[PDB]
């Protein structure tokens, strides 16, 4: 239950549904290197 | 239909009574759960152009302490509410000295009036609710755990014990239907008690953003 | 012990069974009988119990002392206070007071015993009632201690006030236990007697706990209800201004009050909670009017209401205090001078000196503006002149509030100036003022160039402080400093 609770708590620790894509992970303030580590790499760095 | 309308008006009345009681108001105990037949006796069993029409059952409640503030609840006659309808309610409120109020719209609000509701928010606060939101007290649902609004002293105690800031709490939307139910504003931490199958009880906290 | 109807017969048998023969069968037959239980069980008790004790049946009577008592509640809750069942309960209570010297009669009086014509006389015939005075407190304890027992219990209020005084130097359930048996007439008499006695003797601390006791009437216990509806906003909000403005408008349009407006001003008057609330609301309103730049009008009416509050207890049959519409600008000119010095230093001492030497509510207002470095360092000589000007009692509580604000500030030179102000006024200071000075000096010694001199001044305030509490607290502060 630790693992299910952690996953369901990271998706809802922002108030809305954080979908696990670029569209939900790359909309929270985490870091340009962290966000470019995921699937969109150049666009995150250009915006940052 | 006419029996369906008095059932629907009674369920909206019941949910508004439970909403005011969960929000921390003076709700009379028999009013908090009356029978449908008691509502039909008190109001008149014909919402179709008759005695339990709208604006008869505008519920005025005060607070359980500091009895000055009131949110005397509104029920518009028309389905689609507009600005020239809510300014009559603004006139009834500025006749009074009280700033909170709830309107219970039937169909959706015109979005100019949605902007208009925000256009007096420091002056006097207006919340709106559709009929479908108030045919079920969503805090009675088994998926919805116990939300409790915290006072500012308890928020200072919380942040001083865990040595964290308001930026760091997990948060909640302002248009969250439970947040809309309790009517909390931005920046107002909500403790949430829920049963956990691995510890028994878990109290989380949701600052409002 | 006590002698009932059967008890008198028992005593007569104990007298006439002392001599004259009368063999055991005849004696046991003439002695008594148990009409409820069967003779078969009474004869099998030798065959089964070997001379047991029948008190378990009396234990069942103790169960009856609950169970039929619930049946007494079944008499009380069904017919809405049945008069015939109440008369039967009164007759049973009379028989139990005559027979038992009284726990079942205690529970039968605690169930419901209003309108008993010989109830209070029967209780005053058993007027010892030491433990009975706390157990008979459902209905019988009301109106019997109003002569002298309420005066005996009044001293625990002063004991709790001394406890709060000792706790601030570092109740709720009891007033509910008093209000368990509590009616309108007894509460009105206790309130009137305590208000007259407090406004004669001290009029200092009793008003705060009286408002706290009136705030403990939330459980539907029934002017006074309007005083509760007024003081709900005083208790709930700490910085309430607009609700306080509505309350000032509600209490400004009063009628010809025959001591009711004076009672409302007494209840508002002397509460450190309510005084601090009114001072913080008046200072927040003054800051809001400075933000508007529209000084005189709502802060003036709030300050006039606070001044009428603070001047209530000096006389009886009075209305309020004067406004002084010319004096208010001269009192609030040093606010404008402090704002001008802050505007210069974020981008005059003689006016504050002359406005601080010509002096009630405005004094506490200027003391409560002291929480909110060149402007404070310039106004500090005006603070020295003020502390040399009046030198009142509660000014040390205002210095403690300024020390709490400075501890929220965390500044060295302000702390040194505050220690100099605390040191230079040891002439006519109380034990509480020197104790708070030593507690603040326990937070002192951030800098090591004056802290050894203050460690020597702790011993230099022991011999001159002839009060044993101040020197004991200095020794305890030295003990806590070495840990």
Curated annotation (Swiss-Prot), chain C:
Presence of the UniProt keyword Lipid biosynthesis in the record: no
Chief subcellular location: nucleus
Record-listed N6-acetyllysine modification sites: 454
An example Gene Ontology biological process: negative regulation of stem cell differentiation
Tissues with expression: Widely expressed. Expressed in heart, brain, lung, placenta, liver, skeletal muscle, kidney and pancreas.
Keyword match Chloroplast: no
Gene Ontology molecular functions: RNA binding
GO CC terms: cytoplasm; NELF complex; nucleoplasm; nucleus
Record lineage: Eukaryota, Metazoa, Chordata, Craniata, Vertebrata
Job description of the protein: Essential component of the NELF complex, a complex that negatively regulates the elongation of transcription by RNA polymerase II. The NELF complex, which acts via an association with the DSIF complex and causes transcriptional pausing, is counteracted by the P-TEFb kinase complex. May be able to induce chromatin unfolding. Essential for early embryogenesis; plays an important role in maintaining the undifferentiated state of embryonic stem cells (ESCs) by preventing unscheduled expression of developmental genes.
Family listed: Belongs to the NELF-B family.
Key words, A-Z: Acetylation, Nucleus, Phosphoprotein, Repressor, RNA-binding, Transcription, Transcription regulation
Protein name (Swiss-Prot/TrEMBL): Negative elongation factor B
Subunit record text: The NELF complex is composed of NELFA, NELFB, NELFCD (isoform NELF-C or isoform NELF-D) and NELFE; the N-terminus of NELFB binds to the NELFA:NELFCD subcomplex. Binds RNA which may help to stabilize the NELF complex on nucleic acid. Interacts with the first BRCT repeat of BRCA1. Interacts with KIAA1191. Interacts with NELFE.
InterPro entries: COBRA1
Subcellular location: Nucleus
Organism per entry: Homo sapiens (Human)
